[PDB]
């Protein structure tokens, strides 16, 4: 949609899109995440996390180490550009971030940091 995308994380550990395009004319961009299905957060929680492609692994390893109560993200992690909370089925969360935080010609990855989901739940974000 205009400077926003709606994305779903389902009970089969899948995001419904795997490529996000942000137009340079946008001052801000909003991601609206929902979780179709019936499984709870401790079993199939999902969040949408954005970092550069280079930082994804560091973000994922340290997130796993933060625990369920920390939504599997290291608090005040400097490499995370934007993120939602970790949501279970039937819940919703959105994030709006400034497009000035993205740079031309840098590769960005969005992903879910719940233990073991990033191998399957990830995609590219591109500023065009």
Subset of 22-61 contacting a copy of itself (CB under 8 A) = 36, 38-39, 42-44, 53-58, 61
In angstroms, the CA 62 to CA 59 distance is: 5
Strand 122-127: give its sheet, edge to edge: 19-22, 122-127, 108-111, 49-52, 82-83
Q: Which among 27-35, 80-88, 96-104, 114-122 is the span making contact with a copy of itself, rule CB under 8 A?
A: 114-122
53 versus 94: smaller Cβ distance to a copy of itself = 53
The beta strands (E) that lie in 36-88 are given as 49-52, 82-83
Per the CB < 8 A criterion, the answer to whether 85 and 33 are in contact is no
Task: Write out the residues near a copy of itself by the rule CB under 8 A.
Answer: 10-14, 16-19, 36, 38-39, 42-44, 53-58, 61, 64, 67-68, 107, 109, 114-117, 119-120, 122-124
Binding site listing for Cu cation: 46, 112, 117, 121
């Amino acid at each position: 949609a205009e400077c926003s995308v709606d994305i779903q994380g389902n009970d089969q550990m899948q995001f419904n899109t795997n490529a996000i395009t942000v137009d340079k004319s946008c001052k801000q961009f909003t991601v609206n995440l929902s979780h179709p299905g019936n499984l709870p957060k401790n079993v199939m929680g999902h969040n949408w996390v954005l970092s550069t492609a280079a930082d994804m692994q560091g973000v994922v390893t340290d997130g796993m180490a933060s625990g369920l109560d920390k939504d599997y993200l290291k608090p005040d992690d400097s490499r995370v550009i934007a993120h939602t909370k970790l949501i279970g089925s039937g819940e919703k969360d959105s994030v709006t971030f400034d497009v000035s935080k993205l740079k031309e010609g840098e590769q960005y990855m969005f992903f879910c940091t719940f233990p073991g989901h990033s191998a399957l739940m990830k995609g590219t974000l591109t500023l065009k």
